[PDB]
Symmetry: D2
Subunit: 112 residues, 4 copies
């Protein structure tokens, strides 16, 4: 009954980051899912839920470079893929892990 | 003549994070360097400089889980290894990429 | 039809900050409202809405010192009242201004 | 022998914020100092030091609205004056309180 969700805010304009590609994958393995955020900078279905969600480490790859490119911007951006590693210990908990994005800085947190 | 440096601040106590292990590696490759921060949460020599520093993507692995463990704390911490991917376009520039750390959230930025 | 809301996350434990007192006031004036966050670190009714919400500057006073005290902590905390000034230009917009809190650092943003 | 310093980073471009006006004042009182950051987003002399630095609360007013205006931008910016309240308990300590700035979000912390 666990759940893993995320949301992206573009601090450069104060609006959610729409159409940003996000990749999910277990630590060590390769991509298992690829999603694109909607207009509220979220995704309809949880990135992980039910059986899918198992205790262990994961990595989310936020394609920030592409997002900011479609908004402007260097040919070789400082931030290309924002990588976020974290561990989900409880398989039945609700994990909200938002991302606050700027061209040269970001904030990751266990939201509510 | 380029340079890559970093520094860690523990927002939980307002002091620099001392003795935190940091791993550096080119995107795709495995670890190339392993360092431990001093008492000011920095390292004597730049993580990258001179020939070592070449245009491309890198990843720094901050061992936050171990750091907070030695300071407290769950057996399976939410944040184990804080992964930071970024691209260094100019081989002759000075890149300062600090990390502001908390048990359930962190901030990455291109400092000065 | 405008709306102003906020939410507090305690990055020290990854849970919303419950029962934190928040003060609202127009720039220059004294407090106009005093609220305490619920268990999700939010408040039932918007801090501002309808006629109440008028174009101009405001200030929110998050009583962080008291919150962390009830959770531990210095007699004279570094952060006592986290002050957040901002301007609401459009009286009919929806403003979400969350606060990510830690004992020695915080993040303010125009969320969604 | 205490010291209070600060530094501003513009996360929108990864460069320090130059020529930003900063106001200092004791809680309750009006401005006591007004400074403008140099090209490294800092100021030559500490904002507070020696006798000047006394245990108590202070407030720094970062004129972000003007800074971003000279860089672009709404006539009525969301962030006009970023207000930062904090308490200095020890008169002989070194307090570094940097600001990570973006148009719609900022991070305040007790740096090193």
């Amino acid at each position: 009954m666990g759940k893993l969700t995320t949301h992206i805010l573009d601090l450069t304009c104060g609006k959610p980051a729409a159409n940003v590609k996000i990749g999910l994958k277990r630590l060590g393995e390769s991509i298992m899912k690829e999603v694109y955020t909607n207009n509220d900078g979220r995704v309809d279905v949880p990135l992980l839920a039910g059986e899918e969600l198992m205790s262990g480490e994961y990595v989310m790859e936020f394609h920030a470079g592409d997002y900011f490119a479609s908004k402007n911007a260097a040919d070789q951006p400082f931030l290309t893929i924002v990588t976020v590693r974290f561990q989900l210990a409880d398989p039945d908990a609700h994990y909200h892990i938002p991302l606050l994005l700027s061209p040269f800085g970001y904030q990751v947190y266990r939201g509510s």
